[PDB]
Design a binder for this molecule. Structure first.
Ligand SMILES: [Zn+2]
Lengths: 278, 63, 286
């Protein structure tokens, strides 16, 4: 009846086992399970993610052991929070992380167990640092083809997620499926130390530790002189003369600005004499 | 691998090195590249057995 | 044995997210769990772990319990998904260690020959690269005490892994990287004097406190020994650089020369080419 676009709140702790357990299955595809709480129709949260045994014979719906979860939920009771299960996830490192033929067969089984059972995919390969990558989807019922086939209200959270549209075969699965919005509920307490732990460990280890003399400048002078004539022949090549040769051509970069910063490296590193000492 | 690719894997695991001198025909699972058992015998199809003949309907007394 | 450890931001978060688990229900003590180490070599690395319900009474300061039904079967869980991952020890968020911590390691030595404990910090404050690591050995003592079991500090360092920087390094998004060669090295210099000379004053005041009170530590002898290794140059009045004086500017010899030589021709590249392309568009248009 009434269906509203869902918003997925992921915890920074749940983001860990998505890429981490997925990295352990690389190259092969894994099968996980999502753990969280259903607040309402238009929003959903995943508060935890745990690792499930990887299948070396290929992913199947029987790869999830029911006594593995029954022993896990009991261990979650003695753990701080015993929250009910919600849905499943699987890695797909070998390709662009789209729902395979097994993923649709385990859909109607998991959506019978739990109401939503959001399908979540993840890939390591698409980037390293500055991209969300991952993936998510939710099955829209094929029996609804008799009814209105274009959910959801509050559109562009889908529509904008429908950008880039990610080639063809991916959105070729937009038949019988619709993706879901992933935003981050603020962990910033942990996220503030995530930046502090990362940059401090990357700043000279104490900031002190790190803080071929003339010879490095004799090797640099070959880049600061012998590179000049191959750079300064181009203005004489800009002289035609004049003018039979196709123009414009700009040879100014990148050596000029590199030798600039090359002195910026050597000047402030030589200031270590004046800085460290006295 | 008969696919014309060649791979590198530790000694099996299960059946040990006691058998045999370097062979073929052994079973191994998909891309995991583990050999469970060393399987005989040789090859192939009609090359192994040219023709299977039980016994003729006639005897040497026919001459 | 264990020399240095590698703590990932992922496994350290597994201590931090459990601080939300039992932090809302309270009450006393801290977050404590069992550590799953990845040991490929003498250098120790940690990937994942599992947090276990734990409590330490005050009164009763020596009372501690792990849940070992949680430790046994959940090991067979992580072992089934990851064969390489095994328990190398335990951890906790400290911030400091009560004397009772001697008994936590000796109990679990049945699991691992040497269990390394990792003291972590849920709220970053000071003074630097956070958390901590200890190793369990027995040095006895020189004074003749019965055999003394005291955890020795293990240097901790953060490390990375493939595919784990996807969501981790994404959420910050506010950092400027880096920039190497201009600001990166000089900000350290301003801090190298700060963080270098603050521990200089904190320790020299505690070393003066020695004569006053708190003796032992005598130490002995490690304090003055490496301080005298710092004494290869003091450097005191005045700098004792008579041999390093002409050498001082002689290291700045070519650095200033090239900076004079590069800026001359870089100008010839910048000044000439700018004037050329400028007047070609400027005056030919009008
Ligand atoms: Zn699959």
């Amino acid at each position: 009846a009434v269906d509203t676009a869902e918003q997925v709140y992921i915890s920074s702790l749940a983001l860990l086992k998505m890429l981490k357990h997925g990295r352990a299955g690389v190259p092969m595809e894994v099968m996980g399970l999502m753990l969280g709480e259903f607040v309402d129709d238009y929003t959903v949260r995943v508060i935890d993610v745990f690792a499930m045994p990887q299948s070396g014979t290929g992913v199947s719906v029987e790869a999830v052991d029911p006594v593995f979860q029954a022993k896990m939920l009991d261990m979650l009771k003695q753990t701080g929070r015993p929250e009910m299960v919600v849905g499943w996830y699987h890695s797909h490192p070998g390709f662009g992380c789209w729902l395979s033929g097994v993923d649709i067969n385990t859909q109607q089984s998991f959506e019978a167990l739990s109401e939503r059972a959001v399908a979540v995919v993840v890939d390591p390969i698409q980037s390293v640092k500055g991209k969300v990558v991952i993936d998510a989807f939710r099955l829209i019922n094929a029996n609804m083809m008799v009814l209105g086939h274009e959910p959801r209200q509050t559109t562009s959270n889908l529509g904008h997620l429908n950008k880039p549209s990610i080639q063809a075969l991916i959105h070729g699965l937009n038949r019988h499926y619709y993706s879901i919005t992933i935003n981050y509920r603020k962990n910033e307490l942990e996220q503030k130390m995530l930046l502090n732990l990362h940059k401090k460990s990357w700043m000279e280890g104490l900031t002190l530790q790190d803080y071929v003399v003339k010879e490095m400048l004799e090797l640099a002078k070959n880049y600061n002189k012998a590179v000049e004539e191959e750079d300064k022949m181009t203005p004489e090549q800009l002289a035609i003369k004049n003018v039979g040769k196709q123009d414009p051509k700009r040879h100014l970069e990148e050596h000029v600005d590199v030798l600039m910063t090359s002195n910026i490296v050597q000047c402030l590193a030589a200031m270590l004499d004046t800085v460290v000492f006295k | 691998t008969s696919t014309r690719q060649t791979y590198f894997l530790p000694v099996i695991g299960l059946v040990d090195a006691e058998k045999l001198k370097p062979g073929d025909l052994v079973g191994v699972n998909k891309d995991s590249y583990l050999i469970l058992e060393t399987l005989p015998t040789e090859y192939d199809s009609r090359v192994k057995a040219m023709e299977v003949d039980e016994r003729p309907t006639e005897q040497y007394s026919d001459i | 044995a264990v020399q240095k450890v590698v703590v990932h931001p992922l496994v350290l978060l597994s201590v931090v997210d459990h601080f939300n688990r039992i932090g809302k229900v309270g009450n006393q003590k801290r977050v404590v769990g069992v550590l799953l180490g990845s040991w490929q070599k003498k250098v120790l690395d940690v990937s994942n772990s599992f947090a276990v319900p734990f409590d330490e009474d005050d009164k009763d300061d020596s009372v501690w319990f792990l849940d070992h039904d949680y430790l046994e079967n959940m090991y067979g869980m992580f072992k089934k998904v990851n064969a390489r991952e095994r328990i190398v020890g335990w951890y906790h968020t400290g911030p400091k260690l009560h004397k009772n911590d001697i008994a936590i390691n000796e109990l679990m030595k049945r699991y691992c020959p040497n269990s390394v404990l990792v003291i972590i910090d849920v709220k970053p404050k000071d003074l630097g690269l956070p958390t901590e690591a200890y190793i369990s050995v027995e040095e006895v003592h020189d004074d003749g005490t019965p055999t003394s079991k005291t955890f020795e500090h293990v240097t901790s360092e953060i490390g990375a892994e493939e595919a784990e920087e996807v969501g981790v390094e994404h959420l910050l998004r506010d950092i400027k990287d880096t920039t190497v060669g201009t600001l990166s090295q000089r900000i350290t210099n301003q801090v190298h004097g700060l963080k270098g000379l603050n521990s200089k004053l904190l320790d020299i005041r505690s070393y003066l406190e020695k004569v006053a009170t708190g003796k032992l530590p005598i130490n002995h002898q490690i304090i003055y020994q490496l301080q005298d290794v710092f004494n290869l140059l003091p450097d005191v009045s005045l700098q004792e650089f008579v041999k390093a004086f002409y050498l001082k500017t002689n290291d700045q010899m070519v650095v200033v020369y090239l900076a004079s030589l590069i800026r001359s021709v870089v100008a010839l590249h910048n000044l000439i080419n700018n004037k050329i392309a400028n007047r070609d568009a400027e005056k030919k248009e009008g």
